[PDB]
């Protein structure tokens, strides 16, 4: 259904104009539609943005406007890219939010950058594998993300491929999007407790053993869900992916395999040949505690090895 009248120009709280296209992706991501600044031509195809539309009362979309109004502002973000001395960074650029009326209900608007591919789809097309060079490279970018999300006081609790997608124009460039159920661990620099949140369950195949034991997640799952993530793009497999619908299932075998990776290295590759950055990276997280701040340059090292070892290094190529 029609949240706007195709064309239309908007205005945002800070009086901003833009102007609202087509929906994206035949509408299979809900109320996503193509925006542009405001001027004579029409909304294109080839649209920077993208304006987000949900009822003002759904907390979602608030809980994510909060995260991007915080820690996705353009200057914000350049700066970080500028003092760290990045290529770029992968979280999306906020533009502005506003509040919209149609047919007597109040909408909520969020302005935000349009990418092209989520990784999902070219994971499938790829017969469900990514090179290690591939892997490296998207888990070096997704932990310059995480450490950046975390020194915002933030977790994401949801990194998989379906989240990640490429920079519109730049094919080796990969974001982190989907903040609605992300998490201010640390409000203030004040550590939430070691216990439930008043609910961010992630998706079950790779959520953190802290998620699976009902307490609110923090650096150290972001950390374990990217550590799974990796293995199901190499192999195309994780152990436990036959009993997705037994959660029970699920954390006791993630439990076993934690106490455990050189198991997990012979589960999940073949009888020694299992990539050795992928086990320090593992055996490097198993020692977080649940308020420990990641040495996340240690954790790029450890990939570094691994580009090193392939005969290759950081150049930022994704080869996808
Ligand atoms: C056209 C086109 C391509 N395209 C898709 O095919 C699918 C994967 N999606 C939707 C994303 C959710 C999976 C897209 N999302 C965005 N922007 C965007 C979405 C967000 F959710 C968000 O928070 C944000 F900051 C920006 N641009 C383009 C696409």
Not at 74 to 81: G, H, L, M
Request: aromatic fraction near 10%; charged fraction near 25%; charge should be neutral.
């Amino acid at each position: 259904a029609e949240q706007f009248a195709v064309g239309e120009i908007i205005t945002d709280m800070a009086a901003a104009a833009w102007k609202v296209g087509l929906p994206i992706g035949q509408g299979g991501f809900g109320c996503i539609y193509l925006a542009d600044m405001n001027s004579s031509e029409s909304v294109g195809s080839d649209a920077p943005c993208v304006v987000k539309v949900e009822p003002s009362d759904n907390g979602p979309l608030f809980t994510e406007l909060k995260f991007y109004q915080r820690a996705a502002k353009p200057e914000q973000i350049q700066k970080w890219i500028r003092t760290r001395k990045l290529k770029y960074l992968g979280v999306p650029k906020y533009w502005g939010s506003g509040l919209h009326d149609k047919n007597g209900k109040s909408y909520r608007f969020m302005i935000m950058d349009r990418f092209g591919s989520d990784l999902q789809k070219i994971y499938e097309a790829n017969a469900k594998r990514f090179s290690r060079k591939t892997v490296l490279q998207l888990s070096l970018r997704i932990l310059d993300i995480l450490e950046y999300i975390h020194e915002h006081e933030y977790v994401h609790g949801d990194i998989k491929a379906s989240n990640l997608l490429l920079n519109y124009k730049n094919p080796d460039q990969v974001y982190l999007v989907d903040y609605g159920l992300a998490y201010r661990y640390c409000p203030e620099g004040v550590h939430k407790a070691y216990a439930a949140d008043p609910c961010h369950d992630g998706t079950i195949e790779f959520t953190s053993i802290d998620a699976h034991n009902g307490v609110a997640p923090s650096r150290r799952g972001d950390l374990e869900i990217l550590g799974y993530c990796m293995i199901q793009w190499l192999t195309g497999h994780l152990p436990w992916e036959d009993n997705l619908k037994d959660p029970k299932y699920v954390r006791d075998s993630k439990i076993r395999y934690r106490e455990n990776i050189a198991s997990l290295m012979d589960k999940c590759f073949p009888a020694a040949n299992a990539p050795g950055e992928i086990a320090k990276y593992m055996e490097t997280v198993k020692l977080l505690d649940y308020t420990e701040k990641p040495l996340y340059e240690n954790l790029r090292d450890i990939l570094l090895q691994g580009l090193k070892a392939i005969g290759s290094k950081d150049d930022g190529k994704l080869d996808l």
